[PDB]
């Protein structure tokens, strides 16, 4: 069923007032295609037939519901709190990103679009988009920086096995920003037949709201499950925060539960005092970036500061505007977790529970262990385990000296 709209933004995309967070900080050149997608999605998000299509794919293709696992062997490291892992690591493709691309790829076909484009950093969103496009028979083009294509030979081959074209952007700094630039320019030129699959809960309206809608399911499932297994609502629900899609998906269902604390864990890299981090809420300030007014890491002139993290998925200088709203409103707390804290949690989770998490998700695990110590014995903490760690085995093996030289 179509879910309620109490936490939704206004028709301009603003959260918390007609000139607050979110909005559309974009060129007029993009507005025809942004208005077309917005109207398409206003129609489809209340259509029972669309929700049935999406539910059918979630169930049979992607394997939802994902389970909730009480990780009893972590307890001793979390102040004897109880850590429940929402297992998005078991989704098809190994993360929550499948929820998003299924929704958008279905919406692309409803709009009569034959072609989908997207961009990617390390490759994860690229692979997910390509996966959904293969399923629905859409032409798929992924833009990726030349420094990333050369360093991700196997993810490029995944995308190509899936039938997508990978365009290596060799201009400028040859990175994610140059790929984003090309995807937006492609979208404008080919708006007639082309849909842009935005990767996280950010960008211009309607993307923060749409992406969150397609991730709501995590939190909805988790609220039923935790009451099933613990016998009550949790004392806390937590998640890692890049752009913010996995976090907002798990948080949403708990928003009107005033006893449930909500905590997002962001990448502190080498440490927030070092200037090599991606701690947007902790060290950043309000500004317009990538189409929304939210928080970002910026210098005194408003240029974007380069961010650093051991994980690719959290290495983003911004954050989704719904999170900015939830911070200003006092509803969610955002806290920093270092590379080291994250890798310790990664390793702890492999040894203790036999689960290799994504390094991104390991930030949430590490923060959950700390939150456990604060709240003490018997506290119930739901952690979004946003992805599996197969892609990260080489990085983690080097960290722990398992490869040598």
């Amino acid at each position: 069923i179509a879910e309620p709209t109490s936490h939704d933004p206004d028709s301009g995309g603003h959260f918390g007032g007609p000139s607050g967070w979110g909005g559309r900080y974009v060129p007029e050149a993009l507005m025809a295609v942004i208005e077309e997608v917005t109207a398409a999605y206003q129609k489809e998000r209340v259509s029972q037939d669309f929700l049935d299509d999406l539910d059918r794919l979630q169930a049979n293709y992607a394997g939802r519901p994902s389970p909730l696992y009480e990780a009893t062997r972590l307890s001793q490291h979390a102040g004897s709190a109880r850590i429940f892992l929402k297992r998005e690591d078991l989704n098809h493709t190994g993360s929550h990103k499948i929820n998003n691309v299924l929704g958008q790829a279905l919406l692309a076909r409803r709009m009569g679009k034959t072609r989908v484009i997207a961009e990617t950093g390390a490759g994860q969103h690229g692979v997910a988009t390509a996966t959904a496009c293969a399923l629905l028979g859409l032409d798929c083009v992924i833009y990726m920086g030349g420094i990333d294509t050369a360093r991700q030979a196997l993810n490029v081959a995944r995308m190509r096995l899936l039938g997508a074209e990978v365009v290596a952007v060799q201009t400028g700094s040859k990175t994610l920003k140059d790929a984003i630039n090309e995807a937006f320019r492609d979208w404008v030129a080919n708006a007639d037949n082309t849909y842009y699959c935005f990767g996280t809960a950010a960008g211009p309206h309607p993307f923060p709201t749409m992406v969150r809608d397609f991730q709501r399911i995590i939190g909805m499932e988790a609220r039923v499950q935790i009451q099933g297994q613990a016998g009550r609502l949790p004392d806390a629900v937590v998640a890692c925060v890049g752009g913010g899609s996995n976090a907002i998906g798990i948080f949403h269902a708990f928003l009107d539960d005033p006893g449930v604390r909500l905590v997002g864990f962001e990448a502190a890299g080498d440490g927030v005092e070092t200037g090599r981090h991606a701690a947007t809420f902790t060290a950043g300030s309000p500004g317009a970036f990538h189409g929304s007014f939210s928080y970002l890491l910026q210098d005194e002139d408003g240029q974007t500061i380069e961010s650093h993290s051991i994980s690719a998925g959290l290495d983003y200088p911004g954050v989704g505007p719904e999170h900015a709203w939830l911070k200003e409103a006092g509803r969610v707390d955002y806290r920093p977790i270092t590379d080291s804290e994250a890798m310790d949690a990664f390793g702890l989770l492999c040894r203790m529970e036999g689960i290799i998490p994504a390094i991104e998700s390991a930030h949430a695990v590490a923060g959950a262990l700390k939150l456990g110590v604060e709240l003490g014995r018997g506290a119930v903490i739901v952690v979004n385990l946003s992805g599996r760690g197969d892609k990260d085995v080489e990085t983690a093996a080097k960290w722990f000296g398992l490869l040598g030289n």
Partner: protein, 249 residues
């Protein structure tokens, strides 16, 4: 009350010509050399100068301008160097507006930057990633400090949005892009008498003249950057050719 740039276009239309509108980014190839280039534009026959604020994540900038803005930033260019460039252009007898993405303005403070631009002699702001829907602070600052406000329209712009964008503009409206450009200008003229500048990857006298048949202003940027990279004399020669092109009789 008239716009700040209105007399330039009245003066142009009374001499049967379009205004030449030249863009260069502050700090390319370094801060002093960019100021010398902007001053040279004034001397070579540019009616309005678009002083570009280099930004770290441009969406609209094509590859020539994007390479130059990246270099200017590697050189350590500051937003206050754009205010200094505006002072120099005004001192040279020029007319200057600033072209900028919105975040540097938000960071500076919108009211603060409007005041400091006006104090530097600037006549307006071109806002390629600011649409009227998000422009409430800017309209108040624009009116308070008497600055023209040039929003962009595009071939894809709906009638509803083209009307709102033209209504929110003062000075001129930037029609950015084979037959798409004169048709877009025609759609602006149908609802408003406001001057229209056209950007169309202009690199020659002949292209300036084609655009001057239907538009009040010819906007040039990429080609000026490409010329400056060669050297200041190439920029003077190009600007002279472009100035002859905007003149019909």
């Amino acid at each position: 009350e008239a716009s700040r740039l209105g007399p330039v276009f009245d003066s142009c239309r009374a001499n049967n010509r379009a205004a030449l509108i030249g863009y260069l980014p502050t700090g390319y190839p370094d801060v002093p050399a960019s100021v010398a280039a902007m001053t040279a534009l004034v001397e070579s026959g540019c009616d309005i100068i678009e002083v570009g604020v280099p930004y770290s994540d441009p969406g609209m900038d094509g590859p020539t301008i994007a390479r130059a803005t990246e270099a200017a930033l590697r050189g350590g260019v500051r937003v206050r160097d754009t205010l200094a460039a505006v002072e120099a252009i005004s001192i040279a007898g020029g007319r200057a507006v600033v072209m900028t993405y919105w975040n540097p303005v938000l960071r500076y403070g919108v009211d603060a930057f409007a005041r400091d631009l006006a104090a530097a002699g600037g006549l307006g702001l071109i806002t390629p990633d600011l649409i009227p829907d998000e422009a409430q602070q800017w309209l108040a600052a624009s009116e308070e400090h008497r600055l023209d406000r040039i929003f962009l329209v595009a071939p894809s712009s709906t009638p509803e949005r083209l009307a709102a964008t033209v209504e929110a503009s003062r000075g001129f409206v930037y029609a950015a892009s084979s037959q798409a450009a004169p048709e877009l200008v025609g759609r602006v003229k149908a609802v408003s008498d406001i001057p229209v500048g056209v950007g169309l990857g202009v690199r020659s006298r002949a292209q300036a003249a084609q655009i001057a048949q239907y538009a009040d202003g010819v906007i040039v940027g990429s080609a000026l950057v490409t010329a400056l990279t060669e050297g200041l004399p190439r920029l003077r020669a190009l600007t002279g050719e472009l100035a002859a092109g905007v003149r019909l009789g």
